Every structure is written in C-alpha cells, then in structure tokens.
C-alpha cells in the first residue's frame, strides 16, 4: 500500500539491519521516481517522516519544476547517505553460516581453505547488478536473504583461474578447474562480509565529461551518485576440494590476485583487497 511507501525511510533508519535492504531500496525507488507526486496534496506526512523537509527547503521560487528537480537530487544523495550510515554490518549470522557449513563439509571429507580478505579501497562488485539500479543506476551484488552484499563464488573462481592460467599455462589451468569435457576439482563459495570497521555501504560519484564525446563543444559533466562498499570490510569464503593437489596452486595464487582488483573499476584502483588470513583443514 502507499501507506507502506510514505513510511519507508523511517523504517530504514529505525531497523537498520533487520529491514530487507533489497525490498527497502526497491520501494524507496517508487518515492524517488515519483518525487513531485509524493510532495503534493497535503500528504499524510508525519512530523518525523524524512520527506516534509523538502516542503520547508526552497531551492527555487521562480520555477515549480526546477525546485522539484533539485529536491530530487538532494533526496538521492540523502538516500545514499541514509543507506550508508543506517544499514551497517552484523556479522554473527555470517560467522554461524560459515562455521556450520565448514562442519558440514568436514562431514563430507573435503579439504577446506577458509579465506578472510579485507577491503582496502572502496570496492564495487556487481555494478550492473540490481540494487539501487532504480535509484542510482549502479547496483551492488547483494544477497536478499542473507541481506548482505557478497562476492559471487563464480567471480572469485574466474579471477583465480585467469591468474593460474596466466602463470601455469592454460592446460594446467584446465587440469585444475576442468574444461567443457571434464569437471573442475576446486569448489568456491560466495564471500560474505563478516566484520566492518564502521560502515558497510559508502556513497561515491563518477562524473564523465568526455566519455564518447567528439570535442570540447559537447562536454558536460554527468555525475553519478552510487553506492560502494566501505574500506576495511572483511569478507570470508571457503574453498573446498578432495584431491589435495589442487590445494597447492590455490595456496599461492590467492595472496597474489587480491592485491590486484577483485571487482569493478579496478584500473582506477577501486576493488583492492588484502589477504587477512588463510587456513587449510586437510581431511584426507
């Protein structure tokens, strides 16, 4: 109902880890995309809802449209900051998930490699993913049931395999990760954040001036307020296998690729990690 809509931002700032962030943003986007509508007709705005602020603030008196189109960008930045400061990380459920799963895999006779990695620079993963895409145009790889961003297991495995096949030959790479006519020998799980310093999501911006432009004559900044992942957020993920051989090239590759990129925009130094810890539990 629209009642659920008008009352969504206070839900965000008063639940803060127990509201479904996927649904929360998807519903906030209906307010964001219909701004000049929710700001009319003596709405049922309480005296604490974060929207009547824009009934006070007057950014343009000559034009009724430009006032709204400015309030809308103010509101987009405000939503980015809201998500950033309210939705923080509680990583007890992730520790439980990973330790339970580790026991499960020990009960399956696997050799496990628990890997904790820490974000150094504001990271982006799944920028074309849909979380904020209806607001920011730029998403984040999010898991709407663990309610946390994550690094897909496929992505970590693909980066590791690109490295291994860069240094050991595309034939030993296929011996480790299989090919179109054989199965791989190493299995990866997604990386979920276990502990942050203060924040999980942080706003950022990208303002292309001369991207796909012919001359200085059509250059014009087009800023893109999006959300990234804070520095010092720690992700852990497991790497399990059966034949211990494939554990040798996973040992050395992992601390070498993380210092390069692990997500998007890494050629301008964004998705940079560092191997916080590694640990093998052999089960032969």
């Amino acid at each position: 109902a629209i009642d659920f809509l008008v009352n969504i931002l206070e839900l965000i700032k008063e639940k803060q880890c127990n509201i479904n962030l996927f649904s929360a943003i998807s519903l906030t986007s209906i307010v964001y995309n219909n701004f000049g509508e929710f700001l009319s007709n003596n709405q049922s705005y309480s005296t604490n809802n974060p929207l009547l602020k824009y009934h006070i603030i007057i950014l343009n008196d000559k034009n009724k449209t430009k006032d709204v189109e400015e309030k809308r960008n103010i509101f987009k930045r405000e939503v980015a900051e809201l998500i950033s400061r309210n939705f923080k990380l509680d990583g007890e459920k992730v520790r439980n998930y990973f330790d339970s799963l580790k026991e499960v895999l020990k009960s399956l006779k696997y050799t496990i490699v628990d890997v904790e990695i820490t974000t150094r620079t504001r990271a982006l993963i799944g920028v074309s993913t849909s979380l904020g895409k209806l607001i920011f145009g730029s998403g984040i790889s999010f898991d709407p049931y663990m309610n946390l961003p994550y690094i897909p297991a496929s992505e970590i495995k693909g980066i590791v395999r690109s490295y291994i096949e860069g240094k050991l030959g595309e034939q030993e790479a296929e011996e480790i990760f299989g090919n179109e006519e054989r199965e791989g020998n190493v299995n990866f799980t997604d990386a979920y954040p276990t502990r942050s310093k203060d924040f999980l999501f942080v706003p950022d911006v990208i303002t292309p001036h001369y991207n796909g432009k012919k001359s200085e004559a059509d250059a014009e900044p087009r800023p893109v307020i999006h959300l990234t992942i804070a520095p010092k957020v720690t992700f852990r993920f497991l790497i399990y296998y059966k034949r211990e051989d494939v554990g040798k090239p996973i040992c050395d590759s992992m601390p070498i690729i993380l210092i390069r990129g692990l997500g998007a925009r890494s050629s301008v130094g964004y998705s940079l990690f560092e191997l916080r810890k590694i640990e093998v539990i052999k089960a032969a």
Binding site: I2, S26, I30, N34, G36, E37, N41, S130, K133
Partner: protein, 154 residues
C-alpha cells in the same frame, strides 16, 4: 477478439517501430527491450514501471505524442535518443495494460499527465499486482525477440 501475447507484441512493436524516426532511437529502444524484461523480475513490475516513467522524462511534447500514438499511425516520438527509447517502452507496457483490459486507457492517460492521480495509480497497481505480473513477462520476452531481431546493434 482476444489477441495472444505474441500477436499483441507484433501489433505494439509495429506501432513503436514506425514511430522512432531516428535510428539511434530504435537502437536505444532495442537496448531497453533486452534488459528491462530482466529488471522487472529482479525488482518488480511496480518499481520498474515507475522507473520507466521517470527515465522517459515525460511532461513535454513527449506526452501528447504518446497519447496520440495510441491512435495516430503518424505520431512521432521526439526527444533525446535515450528519452524516446524509454517512452517507447512505456508505450509498450501501457499498450499491454490497456489491451489486456487490466487498466482503463483514460485512467492511465490521466495518471500519467498529472500528480494527484499518480498516487492512486500506484495503489491500483498494487491491487492488480498478481493480475499483471502473471503473464507480462512473456509479452515482454516477445518484444525482446522482436527488437533484437528487427534492429541492429549500436
């Protein structure tokens, strides 16, 4: 008479394809067709519907052109090459909602052009969420095939 999803897609895409005079508009429409059908699943028909209405940047000459496209055979979408693509995809979705009789035409053209009705349109959409979401993704998949068949890449 009842036209199925693919016949409806043909009838709509024919109106659209013949309204985007600029070819860049056509290719942008193609790139919208290819991805909005997945965005609608991932986010929902209602969020994505209003996201389309916003990206269309309506309330210009870009609105009476749309309402004439429903019966003109000459109506020409105009605007930035990214606005016309979203306005065409909006016409696609409105054509479905109208032909399937899920929502009245005049109610939609009223809820588009000013604000007091946009909110009760939100409410109406939330009422008909299962009626709509049941079968619109097949119509949009048909539109996606038609688009990435009848139009070249950018």
């Amino acid at each position: 008479l009842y036209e199925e999803d693919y016949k409806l897609a043909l009838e709509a895409f024919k109106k659209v394809f013949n309204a985007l005079t600029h070819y860049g508009a056509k290719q942008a429409f193609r790139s919208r067709a290819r991805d909005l059908v997945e965005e609608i699943y991932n986010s929902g028909f209602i969020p994505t519907f209003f996201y389309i209405i916003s990206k269309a940047e309506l309330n210009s000459d870009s609105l009476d052109s749309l309402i004439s496209l429903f019966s003109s055979d000459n109506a020409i979408l105009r605007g930035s090459d990214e606005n016309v693509s979203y306005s065409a995809y909006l016409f696609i979705i409105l054509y479905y909602l109208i032909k399937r009789g899920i929502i009245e035409q005049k109610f939609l053209i009223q809820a588009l052009r000013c604000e007091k009705t946009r909110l009760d349109l939100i409410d109406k959409l939330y009422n008909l969420a299962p009626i709509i979401s049941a079968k619109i993704r097949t119509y949009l998949l048909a539109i996606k095939r038609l688009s990435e068949a009848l139009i070249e890449a950018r």
